C-alpha cells in the first residue's frame, strides 16, 4: 500500500520530468548570442554607513528609495537616509538575534524577525516622541528568515519550521499557512503585482504560493544544496535562486524549468543574497567570499565584480528607481554603491 | 541648510549618543552559547546558576561574576536542523557543551555533535567549554557493576589512567578511569583537527554543583588571554 503510493509518486515524477524535457527546445545560451555583451560594469562606494556594532543580517529599502532599514545582531534596527548618512530612527529590540527586516510600502511600518520565533511589527509615523511595538505576531515553530509586507495589515513570513504563513496584523492570528516544504525556508520574494510569492528552502527547492488560495502552485528543482536567497524578476515571470553549492540559477514560471546556471570553476563559496536591477539585466549576488558579484541574466557571464567588505556579505537590495545598491555585511558596514559615467 | 537639516543633524547626534552609550555596555559583556541535549542536565545548569543574578526560540540568562557580565543563550523550541541558525553564533566568546557522561548509549551521538561543532566553518575560532554532567550517576553506575562501558567503546580494555589525573578523595580507580576515558574521547576529537585558533576545556561537572559560573569565568579569561597572546606572537 505505502509502496504503491511510492510507485504512484514515482510515476507522477517521471511524467513531470518528461513533460518538462519536452518544452525545452532552445537553451537560452543559443538564443542570446546575437545579444551584445554588457561589457564591464564597475561601481564605486558612494556612501558607507556605520553605527552598527555587530554583523548586519538584513536590509530593506523603501518605496521612496531614500530611507532604508538595517538589522544587526546587537539588537538594533536603524533607519538610514542614504542621501545624507543621517540616522532617523534607532529602535532597540527585545531579542538580540535577528535575521530579517522589512519596510512597509506606505513607509509607516517596519518589521523584524529572528531566532525568537516572533515577527515584530514596529509603527513609525506616530508623532509623540517614541517608536512603539505595534504588534508581535507569534505562532511559528522555528526561526523566522524573511518577512515582507503586502499592505499595512497583511504580512508574509518564512520560518525554519519548514513553512510560510500569511498573518493579519490587527487580528494577530494566522490567516493562512503554506506547507509543503520538507526543509526549513530561507527566503521569500513577493510578486510585483502582490498576487503570488516565491519561496526557497534548504531542501533544494523553490515554489510559488498563491496568497489567496493557500495552496502551492508549482515546484522547481535543480540545486544541489540549500537555497539561500530568492528574488522576483521585475515581473512575476521569473525568479533567481542562489544556492549553497556556489551556483545561481534562473527559473521561469511559464516553462516550469531551469533557464540559466551562473557559476564559475573558481567560485566554491556559497551565495547569500540576490536581487535584480530594474531591467532584469543585472542580477546582483553576495557571496561568502567577502565579495558581491554582478551577473547578467541573459548571458551567464560575470560582467561585473563588486568588492570592499572585510567579511561575509549578508544583504543586498536595489532601489525601486534603480539608482543605488545597498550591501550590508558581517563587518557592520552598509555600502551604498552607484555607478558612474 | 534649512531648519529641516538642523533637526535632522540633531536627531543623528542624539541617536549617535545613544549608540555610544550602548556600545559601552555591549563591548563590556561576553556572550556564551549553551548547547546540549535532552538527557543532559542543561536545564539544571541554567536553573542552579540563577544566583546573584543582576513559543520561544531563545532563552537568555544574564549572570555577573566578579563584576563581569555574561549572556548565555539556550535555543529552545526549534527544529533539530541546526546547520543554519548556528552561523549566527560566530562572535560569541565560548560554546558551553553539556554532555551526559552517564548514558553509555547516546554518548557517541554527543561525540558526533561535538565533532560537527568543532570542525564547522564559522566556528573554527570559538572555544568549547565542555561539561561532562551527571557524574554521581556515572560513579554509581560503574561501581554497582552493571552495563559495562567496554561493550559500547572497545578501546577501554587497553586504557590506563593518564598520569596527570587528579582523583578526588574517596574515589575508586575504576570511576577515575571511566571519568577520564570519556574526557579523552572528547579531547581526542578536540586536538585532532583544529589548529591553535581555539581550544576545548573539559570539566567534570555535576547537576547540583555550585561553581559553574566561576569555571566559565576562568576559561573565558584563558580564551581572551590565549587570543591576545597569539596576536602578540608570544605563546
Amino acid at each position: 500500500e505505502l509502496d504503491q503510493l511510492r510507485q504512484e509518486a514515482e510515476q507522477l515524477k517521471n511524467q513531470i520530468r518528461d513533460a518538462r524535457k519536452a518544452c525545452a527546445d532552445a537553451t537560452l545560451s543559443q538564443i542570446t548570442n546575437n545579444i551584445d555583451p554588457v561589457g564591464r560594469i564597475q561601481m564605486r562606494t558612494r556612501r558607507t554607513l556605520r553605527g552598527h556594532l555587530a554583523k548586519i543580517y538584513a536590509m530593506h529599502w523603501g518605496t521612496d528609495s531614500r530611507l532604508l532599514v538595517s538589522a544587526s545582531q546587537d539588537g538594533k534596527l536603524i533607519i538610514w537616509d542614504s542621501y545624507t548618512t543621517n540616522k532617523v530612527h534607532a529602535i532597540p529590540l527585545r531579542s538580540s538575534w535577528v535575521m530579517t527586516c522589512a519596510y512597509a510600502p506606505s513607509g509607516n511600518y517596519v518589521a523584524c524577525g529572528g531566532l525568537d520565533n516572533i515577527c515584530s511589527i514596529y509603527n513609525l509615523k506616530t508623532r509623540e516622541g517614541n517608536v512603539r511595538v505595534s504588534r508581535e505576531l507569534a505562532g511559528h515553530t522555528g526561526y523566522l528568515s524573511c518577512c515582507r509586507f503586502l499592505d499595512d495589515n497583511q504580512i508574509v513570513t518564512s520560518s525554519g519550521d519548514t513553512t510560510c504563513a500569511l498573518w493579519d496584523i490587527e487580528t494577530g492570528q494566522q490567516t493562512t499557512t503554506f506547507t509543503g516544504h520538507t526543509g526549513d525556508v530561507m527566503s521569500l520574494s513577493l510578486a510585483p503585482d502582490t498576487r503570488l510569492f516565491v519561496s526557497g528552502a534548504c531542501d533544494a527547492s523553490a515554489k510559488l504560493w498563491d496568497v489567496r488560495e493557500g495552496m502551492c502552485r508549482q515546484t522547481f528543482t535543480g540545486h544541489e544544496s540549500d537555497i539561500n536567497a530568492i528574488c522576483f524578476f521585475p515581473n512575476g515571470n521569473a525568479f533567481a535562486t542562489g544556492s549553497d553549492d556556489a551556483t545561481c540559477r534562473l527559473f521561469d514560471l511559464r516553462a516550469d524549468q531551469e533557464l540559466m546556471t551562473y557559476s564559475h570553476d573558481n567560485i566554491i563559496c556559497g551565495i547569500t543574497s540576490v536581487s535584480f536591477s530594474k531591467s532584469g539585466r543585472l542580477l546582483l549576488a553576495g557571496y561568502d567570499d567577502f565579495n558581491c558579484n554582478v551577473w547578467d541574466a541573459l548571458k551567464a557571464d560575470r560582467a561585473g565584480v563588486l568588492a570592499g567588505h572585510d567579511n561575509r556579505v549578508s544583504c543586498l537590495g536595489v532601489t525601486d528607481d534603480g539608482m543605488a545598491v545597498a550591501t550590508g555585511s558581517w563587518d557592520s558596514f552598509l555600502k551604498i554603491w552607484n555607478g558612474s559615467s | 541648510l534649512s531648519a529641516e537639516d538642523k533637526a535632522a543633524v540633531e536627531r543623528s547626534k542624539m541617536i549617535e549618543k545613544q549608540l555610544q552609550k550602548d556600545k559601552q555596555v555591549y563591548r563590556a559583556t561576553h556572550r556564551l552559547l549553551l548547547l546540549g541535549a535532552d538527557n543532559s542536565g542543561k536545564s539544571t545548569i541554567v536553573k542552579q546558576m540563577r544566583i546573584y543574578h543582576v513559543t520561544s526560540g531563545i532563552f537568555e540568562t544574564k549572570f555577573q561574576v566578579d563584576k563581569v557580565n555574561f549572556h548565555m543563550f539556550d535555543v529552545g523550541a526549534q527544529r533539530d536542523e541546526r546547520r543554519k541558525w548556528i552561523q549566527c553564533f560566530n562572535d560569541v566568546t565560548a560554546i558551553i557543551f553539556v554532555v551526559d557522561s552517564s548514558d553509555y548509549n547516546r554518548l557517541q551521538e554527543a561525540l558526533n555533535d561535538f565533532k560537527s561543532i568543532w570542525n564547522n566553518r564559522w566556528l573554527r575560532t570559538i572555544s568549547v567549554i565542555l561539561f561532562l554532567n551527571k557524574q554521581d550517576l556515572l560513579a554509581e553506575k560503574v561501581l554497582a557493576g552493571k552495563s559495562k562501558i567496554e561493550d559500547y567503546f572497545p578501546e577501554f580494555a587497553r586504557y590506563t589512567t593518564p598520569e596527570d589525573a587528579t582523583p578526588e578523595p574517596g574515589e575508586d580507580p575504576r570511576v577515575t578511569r571511566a571519568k577520564y576515558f570519556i574526557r579523552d574521547e572528547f579531547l581526542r576529537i578536540s586536538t585532532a583537527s583544529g589548529d591553535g585558533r581555539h581550544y576545548c576545556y573539559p570539566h567534570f561537572t555535576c547537576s547540583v554543583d555550585t561553581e559553574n559560573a566561576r569555571r566559565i569565568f576562568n576559561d573565558c579569561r584563558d580564551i581572551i588571554q590565549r587570543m591576545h597572546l597569539r596576536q602578540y606572537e608570544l605563546l
Epitope: 528543482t221 544544496s225 | 536542523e81 558526533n112 560537527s116 570542525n119 566553518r121
Partner: nanobody, 127 residues
C-alpha cells in the same frame, strides 16, 4: 532532486554477510561527504559510518569497527557498506545520508528526524 535509492537488505542468519549499496543521482557525487544512518525498531536514529570526499578518511563507531566496512567509488555514483559477522542488534532500517554542503568537512543534521538528502531505507533483518 537529490535522489539516493538503496539496494541490498533482506533476512540473513546471524553471522551472515551482506553488501548494502546506495546509488545516487541528481548531484555532483565526488564533492560530498556521506554517511550511513540506521534506525532499529523501537529506537532513535543513530550513526554507523562515514566516508569523505575522496575516500581518504574512513570512520566508524565502536560497535561497528570490527565487522562493517565503508567504501565509495566516484565514477559510479554509489556508496557501499559491506556487512559481515552480523548480530541481532544489526537488524534495522538503513539510510544512506549526504552531508549538506559541498567542499566542507561538516555533517550537520545527518541523523535528523527529518532530512531532505536521505535514502528511503533498506531493511536488514538478522535472526
Amino acid at each position: 532532486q537529490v535522489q539516493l535509492q538503496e539496494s541490498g537488505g533482506g533476512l540473513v542468519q546471524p553471522g551472515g554477510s551482506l553488501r548494502l549499496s546506495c546509488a545516487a543521482s541528481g548531484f555532483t557525487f565526488s564533492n560530498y561527504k556521506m554517511n550511513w544512518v540506521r534506525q532499529a525498531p523501537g529506537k532513535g536514529l543513530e550513526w554507523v559510518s562515514d566516508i569523505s570526499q575522496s575516500g581518504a578518511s574512513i570512520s566508524y563507531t565502536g560497535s561497528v569497527k570490527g565487522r562493517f566496512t565503508i567504501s565509495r567509488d566516484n565514477a559510479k555514483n554509489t556508496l557501499y557498506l559491506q556487512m559481515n559477522s552480523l548480530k541481532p542488534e544489526d537488524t534495522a532500517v538503513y539510510y544512506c545520508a549526504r552531508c549538506p554542503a559541498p567542499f566542507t568537512r561538516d555533517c550537520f543534521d545527518v541523523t535528523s528526524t527529518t532530512y531532505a538528502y536521505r535514502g528511503q531505507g533498506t531493511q536488514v533483518t538478522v535472526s
